[PDB]
């Protein structure tokens, strides 16, 4: 009656396709070796716990948000603060930078993902529109176009927004638990969202349905990022491990964990080549993982509190990190 | 200097932004952050004044910012840490609700749910050294109902009189027993709605006592 037999068939089909793990294939790949990551720029000015930051397409501009009620855009090269946008709700949980750099989004414990226009002829940054369609805290708001933005909310459903109209173009209600993160594909045709139910679902922007689901993690998923090729993504969860999933192989490929780590992951990112996986941790440090061999290629120390967010430049020059200590540091 | 004409102006703008951020942070620091949980929450807010709700009130030179969660039914474990460092936690419970079952085929009692929530918040790792201001509301209805429905229905092991004072004392003792870290933090328990202005007085007194105790602990005198 209640789809008893359907559950086992998918599991059997997925298991039947397992022939060789990623680790076995990458045996002949030479180790990357330790990377001498050193902070080149230290960004100060935030006086509270920063929760999210995002790089711009130019690989020089990034935006950060903090519980102090301020949304700051940084000039990475010179560390010059580009804008200081006061958030009307000081509970921000996420922020984003538009691909063109014209607009920036933020979301907090309120159910509104505000859109800010950075290129106003008025000069002053103003809230272009307020997207009040959610019933829970917003976990991730990400731009696909200057007019389309996809949002993640604690209400367990994502929403595609037509910004000019201000109404949800599409709703993604397949998740049963709170969705904590959202990552767009390189082509922006589909996106993946992680949720506290220890599962990740593949969402199609145009049609709006769950093409596939992944359940490797044993705890709440906190972050997900798309592999540069666009056919794979990495997950981050409180399970203290990161897992790699392929959209076409339908099965988990590899995991990133060590016995010395017993705390959850806050954020995950990839380099241009995809060989390096930049993952934040609650132990006030970020560990760089060999994406093809799961070996810890480096550690980014220097944070006095939990690392909340991190990201890699589009040009692949430097990786920014954010921590509850209110300091953002650029690593190269 | 290596900087160009525009770079110097950009640096000037950056340091102006730094000054503005520092000023705003200093302004925000001099303000009391109160977390409210709970049950008479709306009545208490009315007497003392779809996401989290902010309420601002001032009482004799001290400014309070109250953050009502606003019925955030999402995972509280994922955003409770956002309130780490609040001066005190306000908890509201309705005494008269010892009979309600919160539907769900009578699998729970609202008093039991309130006790469980209070225990979870008090034992929360992010509030190890955070005081709790416990408010017992709807005392009139509780007194009216106990005279016709004994509280033993809510506490089968309770063997005592159904008079208002004794039942209230037993409920207060039960709520305070949940504190497994009694030494680190104190629970300021009050029975409200005597008059509308007493709740703010109790909140102010509790905040003042918490601040004084923290100052003493910093110096090692407490």
């Amino acid at each position, epitope marked *: 009656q209640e789809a008893e037999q359907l559950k086992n068939q998918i599991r059997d089909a997925r298991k039947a396709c397992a022939d060789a793990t990623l680790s076995q294939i990458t045996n002949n790949i030479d180790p990357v070796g330790r990377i001498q990551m050193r902070t080149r720029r230290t960004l100060r000015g935030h006086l509270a716990k920063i929760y999210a930051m995002h790089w711009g397409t130019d690989s020089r501009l990034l935006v950060s948000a903090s519980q102090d009620g301020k949304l700051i855009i940084w000039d990475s090269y010179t560390t010059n603060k580009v804008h200081a946008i006061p958030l009307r709700s000081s509970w921000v949980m996420t922020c984003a930078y538009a691909p063109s*750099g014209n607009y920036v989004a933020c979301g907090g414990l309120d159910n509104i993902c505000s859109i800010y226009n950075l290129k106003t*002829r008025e000069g002053n940054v103003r809230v272009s529109r307020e997207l009040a369609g959610h019933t829970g805290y917003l976990s991730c708001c990400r731009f696909l176009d200057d007019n389309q933005i996809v949002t993640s909310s604690g209400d367990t459903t994502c929403a595609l927004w037509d910004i000019e109209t201000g109404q949800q173009t599409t709703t993604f209600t397949g998740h049963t638990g709170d969705v904590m993160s959202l990552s767009l594909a390189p082509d922006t045709r589909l996106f993946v969202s992680g949720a506290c139910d220890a599962s990740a679902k593949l969402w199609d922007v145009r049609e709006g349905m769950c093409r596939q689901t992944f359940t490797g993690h044993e705890s709440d998923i906190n972050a997900i990022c798309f592999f540069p090729n666009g056919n794979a993504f990495a997950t981050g969860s409180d399970d203290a491990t990161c897992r790699l999933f392929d959209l076409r192989a339908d099965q988990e490929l590899m995991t990133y964990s060590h016995d010395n780590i017993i705390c959850g992951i806050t954020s995950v990112s990839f380099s241009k080549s995809g060989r390096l996986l930049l993952a934040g941790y609650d132990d006030f440090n970020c560990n760089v993982w060999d994406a093809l061999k799961a070996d810890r290629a480096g550690v980014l120390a220097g944070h006095d509190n939990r690392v909340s967010c991190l990201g890699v430049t589009d040009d692949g020059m430097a990786v920014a990190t954010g921590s509850w200590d209110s300091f953002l540091k650029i690593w190269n | 200097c290596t900087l160009s004409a525009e770079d110097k102006a950009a640096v000037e703008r950056s340091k*102006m932004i730094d000054r503005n951020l520092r000023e705003d942070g200093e302004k925000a620091a001099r303000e009391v952050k109160l977390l409210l949980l709970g049950s008479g929450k709306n009545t208490i807010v009315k007497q003392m004044k779809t996401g989290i709700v902010e309420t601002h009130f001032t009482f004799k030179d001290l400014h309070f910012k109250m953050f009502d969660v606003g019925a955030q039914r999402s995972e509280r474990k994922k955003w409770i840490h956002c309130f780490e460092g609040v001066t005190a936690i306000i908890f509201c419970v309705a005494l008269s609700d010892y009979d309600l079952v919160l539907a769900d085929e009578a699998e729970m009692n609202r008093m039991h749910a309130s006790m469980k929530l209070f225990d979870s918040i008090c034992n929360n790792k992010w509030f190890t050294d955070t005081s709790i201001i416990l408010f017992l509301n709807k005392k009139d209805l509780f007194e009216e109902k106990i005279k016709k429905s004994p509280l033993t229905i809510c506490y089968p092991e309770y063997a005592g009189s159904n008079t208002y004072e004794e039942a209230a004392a037993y409920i207060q003792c039960q709520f305070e027993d949940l504190n497994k870290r009694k030494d680190t933090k104190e629970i300021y328990t009050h029975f409200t709605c005597s008059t509308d202005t007493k709740n703010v007085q109790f909140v102010f007194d509790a905040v003042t006592d918490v601040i004084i105790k923290n100052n003493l602990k910093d110096c090692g005198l407490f």
Partner: single-chain antibody, 232 residues
Framework: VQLVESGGGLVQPGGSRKLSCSASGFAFSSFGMHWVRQAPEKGLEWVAYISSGSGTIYYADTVKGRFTISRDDPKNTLFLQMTSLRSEDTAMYYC??????????????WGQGTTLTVSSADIVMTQATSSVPVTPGESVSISCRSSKSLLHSNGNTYLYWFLQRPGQSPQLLIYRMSNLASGVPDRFSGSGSGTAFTLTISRLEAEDVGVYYCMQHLEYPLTFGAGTKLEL
């Protein structure tokens, strides 16, 4: 966004007057303001610069001292006090907004302008042709030269192109030698070497008639070129 100058008039020899310029529709406090003078039948010329917050103030060698610049952020207005005005000071002054950050477009908006009549390692910008007779529909290329290389060590080239149509304030076309200013057709293009630059127009329209001016922003002692006056 609007800027409105005021205070124009006729001044006796050695007289003193103050020009004013109010700002509306944009965050005046966050934008640096410049004063650009233009003697009649002559090119533009930078006068003074006051940064946001009044922290940084710059003056031209020929105006420093007797000309002072101040801003009133609460009232959103700009001032330029003048003393010991010389006959050479006969010119019309234009106020220009500017906000400095990566990706910005300095000098993207210009004020109405006000008329005023009376009675050293600086980079010199020269334009090859003062006037170029052309016809509509034909691509027009305007070249300019700089005495000092404008390519800075940071990788940016600080070249600006402005168009001043008859009876209109200057309008920005190119501000970093590669970037097209907002509110302008895509026809305009900018390219050049480390010292040599040109403004190529894909196709000429009726409204493109005017005088084209160039500037270097590598160092603040800005210098204007002769100006290329297109005619049909």
């Amino acid at each position: 966004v609007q800027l409105v100058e005021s205070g124009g008039g006729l001044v006796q020899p050695g007289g003193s007057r103050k020009l004013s310029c109010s700002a509306s529709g944009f965050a005046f406090s966050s934008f640096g303001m410049h004063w650009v003078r233009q003697a009649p039948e002559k090119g533009l010329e930078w006068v003074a610069y006051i940064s946001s917050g009044s922290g940084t103030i710059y003056y031209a060698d020929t105006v420093k001292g007797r000309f002072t610049i101040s801003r009133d952020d609460p009232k959103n207005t700009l001032f330029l006090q003048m003393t010991s005005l010389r006959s050479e000071d006969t010119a019309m002054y234009y106020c220009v907004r500017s906000i400095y950050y990566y990706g910005s477009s300095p000098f993207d908006f210009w004020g109405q302008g006000t008329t005023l009549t009376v009675s050293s390692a600086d980079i010199v910008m020269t334009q090859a042709t003062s006037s170029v007779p052309v016809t509509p529909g034909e691509s027009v290329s305007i070249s300019c030269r700089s005495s000092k290389s404008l390519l800075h060590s940071n990788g940016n080239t600080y070249l600006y192109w402005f168009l001043q149509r008859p009876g209109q304030s200057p309008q920005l076309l190119i501000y970093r030698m590669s970037n097209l200013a907002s509110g302008v057709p895509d026809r305009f293009s900018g390219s050049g070497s480390g010292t040599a630059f040109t403004l190529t127009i894909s196709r000429l329209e009726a409204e493109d008639v005017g005088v084209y001016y160039c500037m270097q922003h590598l160092e603040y002692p800005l210098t204007f070129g002769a100006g290329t006056k297109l005619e049909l």
